[PDB]
From a paper:
The KSHV latency-associated nuclear antigen (kLANA) and the MHV68 mLANA (orf73) protein are required for latent viral replication and persistence. We solved the X-ray crystal structure of the C-terminal DNA binding domains (CTD) of kLANA and MHV-68 mLANA. The C-terminal domain (CTD) of LANA forms dimers, which bind two adjacent DNA sequences, the LANA binding sites (LBS1 & LBS2) in a single TR. Importantly, kLANA and mLANA CTD dimers undergo higher order oligomerization.
The structure of the kLANA fragment comprising residues 1013–1149 was solved by X-ray crystallography at a resolution of 2.60 Å, where electron density was observed for residues 1014–1147. kLANA(1013–1149) forms dimers that are stabilized by an eight-stranded antiparallel intermolecular β-barrel to which each monomer contributes four β-strands (β1–β4). The total dimer interface area is 2080 Å2 indicating that LANA is an obligate dimer. During our crystallization trials, we obtained three different crystal forms of the kLANA CTD, all of which contained higher order oligomers. The monoclinic and orthorhombic crystals of the kLANA CTD contained pentameric rings of dimers, whereas the cubic crystals contained tetrameric rings of dimers. In all structures the oligomerization interfaces are formed by helices α1 and α3, and the interface comprises an area of approx. 500 Å2. The angles between two neighboring LANA dimers range from 0° for mLANA, 72° for the kLANA pentameric rings to 90° for the kLANA tetrameric ring. Moreover, both pentameric ring structures of kLANA dimers display ring puckering, where the interface between two dimers is oriented out of the ring plane. DNA bending has been proposed to be a prerequisite for the initiation of DNA replication and a LBS1/2 containing probe was previously shown to be bent by ∼110° when both sites were occupied. Two adjacent kLANA dimers in our monoclinic crystals are perfectly oriented to bind and bend LBS1/2 to this extent. R1119 forms a positive charge at the bottom of a cleft, which is occupied by anions in the kLANA crystals.
Numbering used by the authors:
A (entry chain G): 1014 to 1146
B (entry chain H): 1014 to 1147
């Protein structure tokens, strides 16, 4: 079964391929990236595309105190037959504002690097808080 | 990389372990289990627990026209060190009403089978629609 990505206590623990995107995010996010005990995890950003490799680096990059990305997952088949897999990554946050910021953080990264894929995305809102405390 | 659950054209195509739960969901959901082109995929139910095998059965059980579950995924480690894994499964719906019905569909199953694990769940709302059309 799938395992959650290994959390980084420091910068050097992140894989080399996802490191520059990670560094970009740590600086981009700033304070928002830090952990807030007062806020509940009821918000997330869903990223989806056809390339799991790119979503993997996004997943590996988004490992912070206030931003934690789940592993690479996928959406169910849209049709009655198996289709080309649409992969996806849920990037969980503590507040709605951080979710919007993460969404743009990717947009900033995509505009900076044309090699990166044009990921589709959406803000996610949960009714109950998730066990990430 | 992870793969999405297989879609069924008929009940006999559903995996054997998930068949008893699938047939129950097909009846309970009834008309709500069917697909609506007019509706957009902006809603979901996230189930989570410690047992991936139960969630895998749930995942395989929920495969309908208007209700489709993703594979067995998981939530990230809460702390800097590794802790016992919290597995999860998103069940995608077309409306909030159906998502509530799916949520209680499992609760009905849990009430129907005390052997089944007690899965924590929450309704999900997406700002932008998801590509599960046509
Ligand atoms: Cl990329
Ligand atoms: Cl959005
Ligand atoms: Cl809920």
């Amino acid at each position: 079964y799938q395992q959650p990505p290994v959390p980084y206590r420091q910068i050097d623990d992140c894989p080399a391929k996802a490191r520059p995107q990670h560094i970009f995010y740590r600086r981009f996010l700033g304070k928002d990236g830090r952990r807030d005990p007062k806020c509940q995890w009821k918000f997330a950003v869903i990223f989806w595309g056809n390339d799991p490799y790119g979503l993997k680096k996004l997943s590996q990059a988004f490992q912070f105190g206030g931003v934690k990305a789940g592993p690479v997952s996928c959406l169910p088949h849209p049709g009655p037959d198996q289709s080309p897999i649409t992969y996806c990554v849920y990037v969980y946050c503590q507040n709605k504002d951080t979710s919007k910021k993460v969404q743009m953080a990717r947009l900033a990264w995509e505009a900076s690097h044309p090699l990166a894929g044009n990921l589709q995305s959406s803000i996610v809102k949960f009714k109950k808080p998730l066990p990430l405390t």
